[PDB]
Design an enzyme around this catalytic site. Structure first.
Site, PDB file in Angstrom:
ATOM      1  N   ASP A 293      12.664 -65.092  36.253  1.00 12.26           N
ATOM      2  CA  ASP A 293      12.538 -63.663  36.577  1.00 12.26           C
ATOM      3  C   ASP A 293      11.098 -63.129  36.408  1.00 12.26           C
ATOM      4  OD1 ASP A 293      13.303 -61.054  37.387  1.00 12.26           O
ATOM      5  OD2 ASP A 293      14.232 -60.574  35.425  1.00 12.26           O
TER       6      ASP A 293
ATOM      7  N   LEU B 147      14.086 -48.341  26.275  1.00 14.77           N
ATOM      8  CA  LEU B 147      13.364 -48.727  27.493  1.00 14.77           C
ATOM      9  C   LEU B 147      14.297 -48.803  28.696  1.00 14.77           C
ATOM     10  CD1 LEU B 147      10.670 -51.387  26.655  1.00 14.77           C
ATOM     11  CD2 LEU B 147      10.275 -49.043  27.136  1.00 14.77           C
ATOM     12  N   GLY B 148      15.522 -49.256  28.480  1.00 11.82           N
ATOM     13  CA  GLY B 148      16.500 -49.425  29.550  1.00 11.82           C
ATOM     14  C   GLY B 148      17.574 -50.417  29.157  1.00 11.82           C
TER      15      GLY B 148
ATOM     16  N   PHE C  34      22.161 -58.275  29.266  1.00 11.10           N
ATOM     17  CA  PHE C  34      22.577 -58.614  27.875  1.00 11.10           C
ATOM     18  C   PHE C  34      23.031 -57.392  27.092  1.00 11.10           C
ATOM     19  CE2 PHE C  34      18.617 -61.657  27.750  1.00 11.10           C
ATOM     20  CZ  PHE C  34      19.271 -62.614  28.492  1.00 11.10           C
ATOM     21  N   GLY C  35      22.247 -56.329  27.188  1.00 11.83           N
ATOM     22  CA  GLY C  35      22.468 -55.090  26.440  1.00 11.83           C
ATOM     23  C   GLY C  35      21.314 -54.125  26.568  1.00 11.83           C
TER      24      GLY C  35
END
Length: 277
Positions: free
Chosen positions: A143, A15-16, A20-21
């Site tokens: 967020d 997905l992207g 974090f990772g």
């Protein structure tokens, strides 16, 4: 905790990348009784940095504790080996922002399925319900935005936390004081003082309603990040009323944008206000 074998995960799509990772979609074998393979969202912790480790833990603690139809469930944890994975509930479609933009193209000649005011309100109410639960459980999301909400093909909404700030949604995050922050969704106290509360989540919810009522337009689009920040510092940050947005719901958006967090409505009040429609 709620250990899941990573060996039963079959990656399907990347997905992207988050702070974090990597964030990817996978088929999880024997995750839920009765079903063979469940499509799930996986967040990896590739950052060994102290702040990122704490944020990853903060997210899995939040999703692990919450239980609501309008909030993604934590389905598994792979913390037995490196890298660590957070296994989250996904949807049959994708993120809310993508859904909004596909529903109504800026090119009027293309085929479209624009959302009616009733449909827009129904999407807003579901987010307010999920956020009322989150805030009832004394959590702060930090967020909230349409990119971080998920939607099914039949417009069922779940609050999530994707944070694809490195690539997919890099245009929605701003380099400020050595961090990548969701500038256009932040209240002045959250970005300028680092003071996050349920009421800073209320400001972000106001912005999210605006994203729904504009079919996913960029808040303050056409203003560079630096201009947005300067207007926010000066108290000149004012999102305009979208065409098709009822006067009553725009004033509600405006109260979510009150300068003092003490004057913004609570999520319970917003859920009720959305119910009058």
């Amino acid at each position: 905790k709620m250990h899941f074998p990573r060996s039963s995960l079959q990656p399907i799509t990347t997905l992207g990348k988050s702070e974090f990772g990597e964030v990817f979609l996978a088929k999880a074998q024997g995750l839920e009784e009765g079903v063979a393979e469940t499509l799930v969202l996986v967040k990896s912790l590739q950052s060994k940095d102290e702040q990122q480790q704490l944020d990853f833990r903060r997210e899995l603690e939040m999703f692990g504790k919450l239980n609501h139809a309008n909030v993604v469930r934590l389905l598994g944890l792979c913390r037995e080996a490196e890298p660590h994975y957070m296994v989250l509930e996904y949807v049959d479609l994708g993120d809310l922002k993508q859904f909004l933009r596909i529903s109504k193209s800026k090119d009027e000649k293309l085929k479209s399925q624009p959302l009616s005011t009733k449909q827009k309100v129904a999407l807003c109410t579901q987010v307010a319900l999920g956020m009322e639960h989150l805030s009832n459980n004394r959590f702060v999301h930090k967020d909230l935005a349409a990119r971080n909400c998920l939607v099914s093909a039949q417009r069922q909404v779940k609050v999530s936390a994707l944070g694809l700030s490195k690539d997919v949604y890099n245009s929605e995050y701003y380099h400020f004081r050595q961090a990548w922050v969701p500038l256009r969704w932040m209240s002045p106290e959250a970005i300028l003082e680092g003071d996050f509360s349920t009421k800073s989540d209320v400001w972000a919810f106001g912005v999210l309603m605006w994203e729904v009522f504009t079919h996913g337009e960029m808040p303050h689009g056409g203003q560079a990040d630096d201009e947005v920040l300067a207007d926010l510092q000066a108290g000149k940050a004012r999102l305009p009323q979208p065409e098709g947005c009822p006067s009553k719901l725009y004033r509600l958006m405006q109260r979510c944008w009150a300068l003092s967090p003490k004057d913004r409505p609570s999520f319970s009040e917003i859920a009720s206000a959305l119910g009058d429609s």
